[PDB]
DNA sequence: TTTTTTTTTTTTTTTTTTCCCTTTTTTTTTTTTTTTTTTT
């Protein structure tokens, strides 16, 4: 089962050699930081997605070690709310990588909403720096500072085109199913 | 039994492929921002039987591994309330992915009733974002733009009728008595 | 024993199948929601038949995880209760729901009948909210606005006639208390 | 699994002998210390990768035993704050090695900023420190002063380039999803 | 693995004899004790890399059991920190030592500084300390007062000079990852 | 493994025929107690090398059960530490024993050098004191009063010389890196 | 190993027939109680060597199972100490005996030093309180009145003399080490 | 092991015959209570001496499960101590029986002598009164008033004689060591 | 072991006819109660020695749980202790029963005799109580009135005499010594 | 053992057949109820000798879960007293019931009466309550009104008359010691 | 509606010298609507 299954010869050096690998502009995002210049980052989903391929969909997995609520501050009808989450990543070998992440809500008047915005953002940007010490694939190249300077002198692509023909459109899905009953 | 079953190569791969699936507009719904635009999301009942069918009634599973009650404040005879839940799913093979969610209660003056609302929300919430780490299928592309943005250029299509002609209309269940009588 | 024995695959498969049902009008119920209009719900026996059916007397199990009184208040002789309750159901398999539910008292001035009414109604609402999460046959498919549509077009059939003809009117089973003598 | 999985004599002698290299200018990065001199340090994503190669992407493991906020104080508008934090890595045969990492933000003004910088920091600091202990390839050796005397004696090279032809630029890994499909 | 492999006769009698050596004037160092005289002590890396050479990169491991501070105080815009660290080392054989460090900074202004530099001290202490239960080799006979009186007797020879040559210039070991391939 | 091996005859008899030895002036040394007179003791590094022969780097282990500061006072400059920890000595065959040691330091003028002082102090004198329970030849005669009378009827020899010829020089050890990896 | 082997025939009735024995002159001792008599003791290191020689360097085996400092007061400059300590002895069968032991400092000034005498004479005391347990031969017989009276009416034997001759001198022990390197 | 080894029927039949058994007067002994009359006791170490007879030195066991003081008053120079403690006794075939005993020191002046009778009488006391429930032959005769009358009927025999001829005078017992270095 | 062994047909069969007994008057005794009239009693000793001949004295085995004084009171001198014991009695096969005693010291001016009195009485109390449980030989008809009316109308006989001639006389028991050194 | 052993096909039948018995008048009494009328109960003693006869002295077992002390309160001299007991009652297969039992001492003067009144009246009922879920012939009739109104349409019996000559008149019981001594 | 007597002696000399220089930059974008009457 998970955290029992050890990997195959094929399957290691497959996944290792991907994840040396870096990331293209088509993952990359950029911000504009407080006082600061334009930072790159990566979205989220392109984490979630990256792990479901790199590992399979049961062959990473998260948890919340710990979440807590730092302060939680009002500034003349404006909350400011800070939040900091452990997610700790394992792999179905029992390999495991834990780290801290951080929510920020300083702008909007709702305590509810800044603590929900604070608290998704924490857990999310822990699961982003957990995943991040498996291998330049999963985000740790986003911090070498010659891949920014070699990812600026690259054309700026305009977004990619999303084909929603094939896309999910019912519940059942025979292909599993049939599989799955053929599974016991 | 369930944590300990290992998935088979056809159920793997299965599920796998059906995971990398985006969704149709029969799923996404929409919702009108305070201040804001329209957003997207999906409904929780569509995500429960997304997952009923990935991976089987028995093949998932979802626990409460905490939920604590932010505040809970009163202005004027309306009681503010914001409620974290943290949801923890869990496949048959082991694999497991667990996230926060929220529920938020602004408007009522019943106590009681604010707190069932962001709990009960704060609950299903989490277990939306604890299903999305799985793949596109189980709303990890809700937060992709290209997505979005590739939804709005489709045929908005009416709500599906449902058929309500073979729905169940008695207890027993003779289907499944016999194979469980015979399980033994 | 329970949380040991695996499904077979004629049990797995009746079971998912009969799981994809949706339930007729012989089981929703209707409501007036305070300032808002009809609702629709399913009484708490409904759900415990209909799992005892769909899993067997012994093919579910529920606990209550932790059950804890929000607030205690009163307002001029009138008591008003709020109690949450965390309810977790887990199949013979293994696989596990937990949810949460709410049990609400504002009318009475007595506060004893005023618990008493909460904690009970907390765990039920809980426990049905637990089920939910199995398929649309376990309720599901309630939160469904198209089959709640649905449901308004179809005769509103009067309440149903229940025989006592072959009810129980004995202690003593003989047709269990010789199977169990077997049994050893 | 990891923690069980023992090593064999050529990957034992082949990481000892890359253990006791020396790492060269490609690695060291030099700040200003205050009132000091130039010191010379080990960015984090170096040692990340050094560790995925001299063990595996698998092959080593960390996790955060405990982090602690020392102090947070306020004087004329700047946020002062101490963070403290205990890293534990351990590689698939049992070894490990504990150390202490610090995160330090003085000068912002944002107390959400100042926390987000200092525990970050302070968990990858103690990561370093904690990779240290295994050998002078992963930063044992940047203690040495007669090391960094002979580091100064060297052609101090421009920053290495970067190239971004091959880097990843689609989700699915075919070679990896091969491997893991016959891995069942 | 660890904590469960014994050790060979033939690795057993060789730590020992090399143990039972005592250390050369290449590897002690000197201070300038407050009030006191010339203290003589051996750096931290120096001590690191005996260990990953007596026993291995995985033959031993150390741990933080607890790490306290005991005290912070402020005079006069100078800050005087004294903090402690329990530190514990096992070899793969199950033996373990455990003893306490100290760190110290008084001179600093800052308190992050200051405790940055304490804990940091206090646990490299500790590792010292515990180290030293070992044997001659491992630090045990810096204390010894005939033996540090036959080390003035020895000619003061000046700072070794480093080869940087053969320096390790590039991420990927395939030395390793050929046995660790071959490892599965 | 540690704890589990069991003693041979032959070791078993050596180490206690060896245990039943006192100990040589070349060993004891001599203070002066405060109002009292010559003390006799064995310093710490001894007993070390006195167990380390005896059982073996690996034959012995000792641990830190709880250390505990028993007050820390301030007397016109002069700061006065009493510290107490409480070390278990435990051999590869499961034998342990366990005593108390402490540490004074009275004084010194700085908090932290007190505090150091006491505590290694404490720990150490555990160890010697836990050690003792041995046998004669790990320090249990030093309290035989005739013994004392004894020490003191022999030739008041002058400070052994130390031969720093064979002294370890380098950091490799080919004799144990060989065994080792043959050890695989 | 240590608490499971079990003891043979012969060695059971040899410890059993040499524990009924009653201890000579050569081991009691004498003090002065205050305002009492002449009362009549056994020192530690005798106890200690007396298990030693009854079940070996690892037949016997103790822990301070709990130490508490039952007061600290000051009268005049004079501190007045009770400290309590609970040892518990058990041998390699598994048989275990616990008792409390106390000690005693009323008449220095230095509370370090009332503190370290109090706490090391309380578990030694308790030592041997609880090795009284297994016979006459360990201590049992110091509380038998006929057995002093007896004792009394003895010949006052002179100290006797230690010889010192083939008393340890150095650390090496060849003698043990051949069986320990014989014992893989 | 201790607690795993069962009684043989020889030995089982042997020690409940000799636990039938009462005592002679060679054990009894009198008091004077306070304001009461003569009462009759068995002095401690009698109970042990029988305990270590009946089953062995390593048949039987006993431990500390805890021991409080219940108080501790002062009047006009005057310490009265409370000590209760609670002694298990347990045989090595499982069987075991626990009892309290108290202690009582009222006299005496000082706290730390009060406290040193008060807290061994009650380990003591508790010790017997748990042995008791073994039989007649280890004190539960003692309460039998008909016994007593019984005892008041024989004739007052004078202390009896110890004989030290042949008492243990050196360390060293080669009958055990034999047994011992064969028991390998 | 205890606890694990299991009763034969015969010794089961027997236990259970010699447990249906009734209580002879040479075990009853009499109190006067306060305020009532004759009462009627068993005294602890007795049943001590009837459960060891029922069960054995290996066969069962007692434990207090918990002990808690409720009241300690002062009158104008007297002082009052009130003290609750919770045994429980367990046999060979596991079966157990548990019940409370209470002990009451009204009367006495010392604290320290009270307290003795109420545990003690407490605990044999209890011990009573919990036997009670397992037949009317233990104790059970003391409690019902037909026996005690029954036991009125028998000859009160006068005190047994007590027989000291075979009585326990030396500590050597040949006939134990002689099965337990077989038992190897 | 207990807890462990599996009731045969004979044995259950029986047992179940005698637990569907109601009882005579020969077993229940009657009371007073303070206000109301004659009501109905069974002795301890009786529901004991049930228990004990029905499944065994060592086919059930009882157990305090817990015992908590409600009230105790003083009104002009008389001490009113309530207290509840948690009673856990298991039969050797490992079926259990738990159930509550009540204490009340409300007319004494003595705080020890009323609290040893209390307590053990609210263990012994707490049985009562537990047992009674094990069927008709164990109490569970008692609440039968039906039963009742039968009850009293019955002769009433004089008390039956109890004969004590058979009655045990000594402690051995060689018909036990022989089955028992052949049981090794 | 249940539970009502048990107990009171040991226990008392031990230690005591160790431990002192580290450690030196990292990290900044998420996320968005659920939920419905229940009991004696
Ligand atoms: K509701
Ligand atoms: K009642
Ligand atoms: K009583
Ligand atoms: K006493
Ligand atoms: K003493
Ligand atoms: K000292
Ligand atoms: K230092
Ligand atoms: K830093
Ligand atoms: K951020
Ligand atoms: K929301």
């Given at each position: 089962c998970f955290g029992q299954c050890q990997y195959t010869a094929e399957e290691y050096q497959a996944i290792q050699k991907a994840l040396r690998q870096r990331l293209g502009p088509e993952y990359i995002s950029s911000r504009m930081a407080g006082g600061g210049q334009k930072v790159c980052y990566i979205e989220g989903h392109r984490v979630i997605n990256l792990a479901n391929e790199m590992f399979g969909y049961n062959g990473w997995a998260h948890s919340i070690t710990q979440q807590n609520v730092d302060f939680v501050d009002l500034n003349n009808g404006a909350f400011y709310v800070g939040v900091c989450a452990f997610v700790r990543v394992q792999l179905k070998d029992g390999s495991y990588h834990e780290d801290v992440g951080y929510g920020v809500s300083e702008g909007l008047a709702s305590k509810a909403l800044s603590l929900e915005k604070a608290r998704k953002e924490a857990v999310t940007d822990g699961l982003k720096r957990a995943l991040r010490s498996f291998g330049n694939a999963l985000?740790?190249?986003?911090?070498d500072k010659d891949y920014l300077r070699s990812l600026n002198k690259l054309p700026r692509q305009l977004p990619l085109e999303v084909d929603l023909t094939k896309a999910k459109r019912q519940d059942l899905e025979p292909s599993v199913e049939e599989a799955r009953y053929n599974s016991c």
């Open positions: 985000g740790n190249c986003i911090l």
